[PDB]
């Protein structure tokens with residue numbers, strides 16, 4: 001009962017918009033209150049606008065949100081999981097209540113994390129108490145947290161009371177992060193509370209004036225890049241698409257679009273991969289861009305996005321699908337945890353709705369029933385630095401994903417050349433994982449330990465982390481019987497590590513690791529074994545799988561004279577704070593001169609371990625050559641020569 005008729009709303013509206021003819025007529029007659037009521041009728045009869053954040057047909061609420069709404073009725077407001085139980089902000093709500101001088105505690109109060117739970121409780125229970133108290137608290141927040149603009153010369157000439165508590169409050173109640181969050185969440189609040197008798201026409205005027213204020217404030221205080229900027233632009237598309245009746249709604253959309261389309265070209269390589277080289281942030285970026293494309297798509301603003309934006313998103317999805325395993329799992333490179341098949345099924349459902357004409361993602365969403373598969377098998381991503389060998393897409397495939405690209409950031413680990421192998425149902429070479437964030441600290445030694453190069457499947461010098469992560473793709477052959485990847489990295493000073501990976505007969509792999517340069521030290525070819533019972537053999541340098549028949553493997557390393565094996569303890573992390581022990585084997589060679597140190601490791605996946613072949617392998621050239629390589633292996637006696645020219 002505190003809301004007013006904010007007549008200025010009619011200057012914010014495009015009254016020539018289809019459906020507001022009665023609003024325009026009544027406004028031109030001076031009957032602004034009847035025009036407000038007519039506007040409410042318009043929104044209550046409008047059906048061509050929606051959001052993917054909520055489905056009014058099936059509105060549910062959990063016990064957590066239920067407690068948040070019921071507490072919110074008592075003016076007990078949930079703001080922060082670190083501040084439990086939630087504070088009570090008084091009957092006369094003091095939005096400046098600050099018992100612990102923590103700016104997060106005060107910032108996150110203006111999130112209104114309990115507003116939408118009150119809407120959900122209102123719809124599921126039908127109890128008007130939630131709507132009455134929500135409308136009251138909404139008007140209350142408007143009247144107690146104004147958006148004022150003053151400078152030092154103006155601020156010094158202030159009264160002597162709540163004027164400077166409000167000016168000081170602007171930095172807490174109107175930080176662009178919470179302003180954008182409210183821009184998105186208040187569309188949900190709008191859908192939830194609109195049919196209520198508390199949603200009066202003049203409350204609608206207050207609502208639209210306040211929302212417009214948020215939009216124009218974000219438009220003048222865009223963030224300093226980071227995902228804060230992506231979310232701000234996305235939510236400006238939310239504001240422009242859910243309330244297209246505003247005169248500035250197109251400008252709010254274009255802006256957001258113009259920002260997002262500008263940043264996808266900054267952080268996504270042309271081959272599809274996102275520039276963090278982390279599967280988790282690739283997926284998260286896909287969802288951030290797809291959420292904006294989504295709320296613009298359902299309301300008929302899909303074509304306001306440039307075509308290159310759509311095709312870039314498509315390339316990102318195809319990237320994640322290519323680096324993923326047939327069980328929909330992702331490799332644990334960088335700081336990525338494992339995503340299982342259910343969540344990815346949901347993702348492919350949404351993106352499949354956004355890209356209907358794309359047959360491959362239509363297949364991955366349908367889980368096989370409908371759609372089609374790509375016309376290729378092994379796929380290369382030479383700009384991102386990810387290379388996928390595969391002989392199948394189904395649950396019987398042999399797949400290897402090799403990570404060897406340019407420098408990343410503080411999420412990319414020094415693991416250039418490492419890989420993950422997935423065979424017939426199980427990942428046989430899992431990454432060491434991330435285990436903990438950053439995140440300091442306890443927890444710090446574990447972080448730096450998992451970030452080590454010596455805990456991956458690559459080459460180290462003195463078991464030290466790589467001084468340079470700048471892989472160069474020398475060769476990529478994805479088709480035919482002999483598929484091969486040649487990549488090299490200047491890992492240390494006077495240290496050129498070249499790795500060649502050969503997918504042979506769509507069955508087995510041969511990894512040739514040639515280290516050249518003037519650097520002298522202990523060269524360590526590391527391999528991170530899976531967890532379980534594994535047959536050691538230090539005399540012939542062999543490891544043979546003793547697992548349940550389904551995913552077995554036999555690996556043998558052929559090195560120079562004097563090569564030694566070291567079975568060290570190591571770890572594998574699949575989930576946050578979750579981890580298990582496995583064996584970290586290192587094939588070490590003392591490089592005391594300038595001659596190259598060369599290895600030929602054969603990896604043969606097999607169902608029954610007793611069927612694992614014995615092998616032979618030898619180099620053909622005298623030493624390391626820059627422009628070519630010839631080796632020869634033997635499978636149970638049958639010869640097979642590998643060679644290429646650069």
Ligand SMILES: [Mg+2]
Pocket residue numbers: 332333334413415431432433434450456
């Ligand atoms: Mg790792």
